[PDB]
């Protein structure tokens, strides 16, 4: 695990697809507020980084951190939505989001 180009690029690819799926859960959470997306993305990125352990290309760390930031926001927002079953704050974004084809 110290310098396999295939491992690094597959990490890149999995993370990009992860970004796409997290954008999907972005809208999912905006409508609903699920925490499982956040936790599972965290686990996915951590596992991939575990594979990146020993591999030392900066861009992977940068993108991983991007993932970290996104997932942390995911979790915080989902917790906020979990605490009680604001709505306009949800709605205006949804208004903006639903006006986001």
């Amino acid at each position: 695990k110290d310098g396999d180009p295939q491992l690094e690029f597959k990490v890149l690819q999995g993370y990009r697809d992860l970004e796409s799926e997290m954008h999907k859960g972005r809208a999912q959470v905006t409508r609903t507020g699920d925490i499982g997306v956040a936790m599972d993305n965290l686990n996915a990125v951590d596992s991939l980084f575990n594979k990146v352990i020993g591999i030392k290309n900066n861009g992977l760390f940068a993108h991983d951190a991007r993932a970290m930031v996104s997932i942390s926001e995911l979790a915080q927002i989902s917790v906020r939505n979990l605490k009680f079953d604001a709505d306009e704050q949800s709605a205006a974004d949804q208004q903006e989001e639903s006006d986001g084809d």
Partner: protein
Amino acid sequence: DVDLTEDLAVAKIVKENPVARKMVRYILSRGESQNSIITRNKLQSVIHEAAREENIAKPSFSKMFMDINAILYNVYGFELQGLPSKNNMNAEPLGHRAQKFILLNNVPHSKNFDDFKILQSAHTYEELIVLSTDRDLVYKGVLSVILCIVFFSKNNILHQELIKFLETFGIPSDGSKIAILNITIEDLIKSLEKREYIVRLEEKSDTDGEVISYRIGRRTQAELGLESLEKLVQEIMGLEKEQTKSLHDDIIKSIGDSYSI
């Protein structure tokens, strides 16, 4: 024939008044360029100016206002409303007794039409860009967003809280010229003030200086139809008739004392 005869008699009163025509001319000019309310004093002032130019003795002010209102209904289906004074907000149609005046559009929806307008403008925006109509549309849109904010704020939200919510929707609070509008949001605010869409409250707390909150200005308030607001929200979330009265009461909650009802 009710319309025909009524407009005929309207034309007669016109033979007694071209003044009303010129009046609405200035009315709609001032609005279109400005989107403006007008004071009772300004009304009677231009009225006296006209009476001098017409060289005819001044008839009833209530007469005149009612006459022109009916004119622009049969021609425009609209109502000229005067406003109750600002002093009545912090301390029968009055018409001639009301102080601040604007025009109101008095038809209901024609649902398919408004949606088709939505469709045309959809072509518009999708083609648009990676304006004055649209410029004002964004201006009003931010307005409406903030309205909703104040409603979840129960007709009271401080300055900085509003500022945060603006940042919440990606609005650059840096002080740059507004995208497309090339101005500062502050100037927008001062407009809603002059356009009476907002209320700015500044209180000198001896610990924190002047703390500023904001409430809904009577331009919007008179503008803000209840059912209009409600079905608006339904359309915000694409809602059915199910949560109708439930969210109706939720909105009642969001209002509270928002309006001097």
